[PDB]
Amino acid sequence: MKLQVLPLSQEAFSAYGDVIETQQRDFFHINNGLVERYHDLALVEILEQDRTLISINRAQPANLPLTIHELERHPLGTQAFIPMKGEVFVVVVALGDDKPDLSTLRAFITNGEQGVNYHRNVWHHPLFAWQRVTDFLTIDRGGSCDVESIPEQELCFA
Amino acid sequence: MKLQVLPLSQEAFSAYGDVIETQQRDFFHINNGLVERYHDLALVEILEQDRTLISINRAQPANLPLTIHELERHPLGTQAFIPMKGEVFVVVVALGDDKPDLSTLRAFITNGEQGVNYHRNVWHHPLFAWQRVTDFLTIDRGGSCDVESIPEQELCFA
């Protein structure tokens, strides 16, 4: 089953989470104008844990052609990923209350200038780099989530 | 008044906050080993606000030679800064319950591979880039902090 990978945008990703980027986003000038502050880009949410967690996930690149078969979901908290050095990366998402609703499965490749923030219960493929090793700053609950199998998918670019 | 800038390290910065880096830090292997997760790097803390905020601060470079004279502190929450593209940056910190205790004033230059996380009430100079424009991913309360003047300081490298 082929799954076309589309460019990442806030509009197309609205149902799964937030896109962390500055392009076409509102900001406040701070100081003489030395700093531009692009406020509230991602809705962080953590349940059953007063403290949020900041970590660094160093993910290896995946074998090409990419072909996922599993999906995870964190019902207890959101999870953000921001490339450490501005590298491009891929994400696969899907909705569904019980199991992943295949009709809502989507694949997105970033422009190398945007991060991502998965909303609670959103199904997404486990982290993996694209082309070369990559460091991702993570912002989530990360405690102890839900893995589910799906019909093998072969990601395509076109 | 000259102020020598020392290399940033967790040991020397322990009293002001946390250093977000992977070097010599403990991590868990995830998957067959595709991802390495370096858990809890920074103590995020927010008061009088259920939600944490994630934004991007685009700071202009400062005029050389660097010479600060003000210091701010956020009594209500911590504040993290992580360079977007791995660029080096400088930080000035100091403690003190009421006003900045000048005997604890310190300046630090990062190695371009580390972020920083200011603890509550810690005095730090407002954000500014080094050499060239820089994007910083921020993680704080950012509401509406306390600015205080100090004897002019000229930062030096040696």
CB-CB: which of A38, A127, A142 is closest to B56? Answer: A38
Place of tokens 């020397």: B12
**B100 has a chain A CB within 8 A of its CB:** no
CB-CB: which of B62, B80, B85 is closest to A85? Answer: B85
The count of domains in chain B is: 1
Distance CA B23, CA B107 (A): 21
| CATH number, position A156 | 2.60.120.480
Domain that holds residue B23: 2-158
**A90 has a chain B CB within 8 A of its CB:** no
Torsion of CA A15, A20, A25, A29, to 10 degrees: 150
Give the phi and the psi of residue B104 in degrees, each rounded to 5. -105, 10
Q: Give the 3-state secondary structure of residue A12.
A: helix
Distance CA A27, CA A39 (A): 6
- B144: Cβ contacts below 8 Å, ≥ 6 apart: none
CB-CB: which of B20, B34, B40 is closest to A59? Answer: B34
Give the resolution to one decimal, in Å.
2.8
- B95: Cβ contacts below 8 Å, ≥ 6 apart: B15, B16, B101, B104, B122, B123
**CA dihedral sign, ordered B123, B129, B130, B136:** positive
**B80 has a chain A CB within 8 A of its CB:** yes
In chain B, what residues touch A43 (CB-CB under 8 Å)? 51
Distance CA B93, CA B67 (A): 14
CA geometry: angle at B106 spanning B100 and B112, to 5°?
130
In chain B, what residues touch A40 (CB-CB under 8 Å)? 53-55
Half-sphere exposure (CA, 13 Å, Cβ side) for B53? 18
**A60 has a chain B CB within 8 A of its CB:** yes
Residue A133 to residues A10, A19, B115, Cα–Cα distance (Å): 26, 22, 19
Decide if B137 and A115 are in contact by the 8 Å CB cutoff: yes
- A77: Cβ contacts below 8 Å, ≥ 6 apart: A45, A46, A47, A49, A120, A140, A141, A142, A143
